[PDB]
């Protein structure tokens, strides 16, 4: 037992991380087969980032302007291409360490592991959620751009995130591996509004189930509720509205615990309206929304 | 910016994890050079764990009773030995993936990454602290025994923990890699008292520094305190007493922030006596003690 915010083992991704240099700027890239993926702002000076014309800036670069280094190995760049906001550098060598992989565009509220890297070298791994407003609350310093987020499904690494920018607000934004930003953001150093965030209700419910499974039951109450009544409270507290799809996803956890989804909603309602009276749930004094129903089942069944 | 509970990249450790089977019991082992390390209770039935005589139980085993599997590879066991509470199985092949490594006995209050494994396969990685009372609050299911905790220092993996048991209280206990338990625990299924825990004060101070660095400054106050006055409050709140060694370790963080250690102690005092008034610090509604001063500096300087 016990419940931890758990990342995926990072080895498979560690083998794909490289350093990419173009003029003065250095950041991380992802080396899969004979392609290196990295943020296209690797081609920008710090002055350029105020208002870059990426097409013009890239036209001034040739294959040999891109300096790609895997550990001490140098890769030879034989093609370059811009797809949305990623650069794809064709290199002459297939990464011997390419895992089985897919590129996926995750949905807001889903979770993934981030391997934070600097200069193409891994620093740490942590689990995080794509917020409803498509930001992430990460740990990313200068040089972390191009670090990637992923999930693992048996043997297969599903890459879902490439880090591009820190907003002035301190939250993080980035793209899928086809270079499309999550959310309304652009790769330019301007004020950008993320817009209102909300709490991922189905994940909070999943974590309350996790808590019941682990012995934390103090929040179970004698009430129930309706979907529409619960959603009136969700709206007041800036929780995402609960739908039947969410109810369905919680089914297995409802079955394991013998607690009906709508009864758990009633417990949650009481916590929203009354707080936690200084108590804790799985060591948190707040309601945790960074576990999905799948995260909880994985962790509970090994 | 941003501050996350960050594990070390696990690849180097993933390559050393194997499955060890002896009679019916299967758990994880650590394959380094030509030795496999695993918990000695791999030789126990579930009945044996009430009161095992490990010497007698092992005398009934031969090299060929130990079934060691790395992925699909089978290792051949050519020697077996019990050191304290670990078994050391000599195998005929050196692990080609042995990283540079050391075995270390960490001190209470230090942190490490855990690669949680089942059947010799990695499931997840997370960061945790050795509690003052030498337990850990992990996520460990049946089959996770032999999973290991580690730190990485450049190229070198310092293994510090092997998981052995879940206490009835739900906390986790284990050994260093020489097989000596941390704390007063034994590898027997009996009630075992962990004894009073306390909060790792120097780590809470380190995390308040982390918060200042990241913009969370609301808790900075106009007071200061003495070491002895602060320690009178620490004792009341079951915080470890602060010493000058701890003050010294916080020096670099005091320097970066321009906040004297004793002034940060005064902020902490006020939080202990007044709570957090429903506020948060780095997204936590509680005082976090699972970051060491070194953890904070690593994360702040990449």
Curated annotation (Swiss-Prot), chains A, B:
It catalyses: TSAVLQ-|-SGFRK-NH2 and SGVTFQ-|-GKFKK the two peptides corresponding to the two self-cleavage sites of the SARS 3C-like proteinase are the two most reactive peptide substrates. The enzyme exhibits a strong preference for substrates containing Gln at P1 position and Leu at P2 position. It comes from Severe acute respiratory syndrome coronavirus 2. There is a cross-link at residues 5, 90 (Glycyl lysine isopeptide (Lys-Gly) (interchain with G-Cter in ubiquitin)). The chain holds residues 3264 to 3565 of 7096 of the full protein. This is 3C-like proteinase nsp5. The active site is at 41 (for 3cl-pro activity), 145 (nucleophile). Residues 1-302 form the Peptidase C30 domain. Changing residue 90 to R: In strain: Beta/B.1.351. Inhibited by pyridone-containing alpha-ketoamides compounds 13a and 13b. In turn, alpha-ketoamide 13b (tert-butyl (1-((S)-1-(((S)-4-(benzylamino)-3,4-dioxo-1-((S)-2-oxopyrrolidin-3-yl)butan-2-yl)amino)-3-cyclopropyl-1-oxopropan-2-yl)-2-oxo-1,2-dihydropyridin-3-yl)carbamate) inhibits SARS-CoV-2 replication in human lung cells. Inhibited ex vivo by michael acceptor inhibitor N3. Inhibited ex vivo by compound 11a and 11b. It comes from the Viruses. 3CL-PRO exists as monomer and homodimer. Only the homodimer shows catalytic activity. Interacts with host FBXO22; this interaction promotes the proteasomal degradation of nsp5. The gene is rep. It is found in: Host cytoplasm; Host Golgi apparatus; Host nucleus. Residues 1-302 are cytoplasmic. Cleaves the C-terminus of replicase polyprotein at 11 sites. Recognizes substrates containing the core sequence [ILMVF]-Q-|-[SGACN]. Cleaves and inactivates human TRMT1, preventing tRNA guanine(26)-dimethylation of tRNAs. May cleave human NLRP1 in lung epithelial cells, thereby activating the NLRP1 inflammasome pathway. May cleave human GSDMD, triggering alternative GSDME-mediated epithelial cell death upon activation of the NLRP1 inflammasome, which may enhance the release interleukins 1B, 6, 16 and 18. Also able to bind an ADP-ribose-1''-phosphate (ADRP).
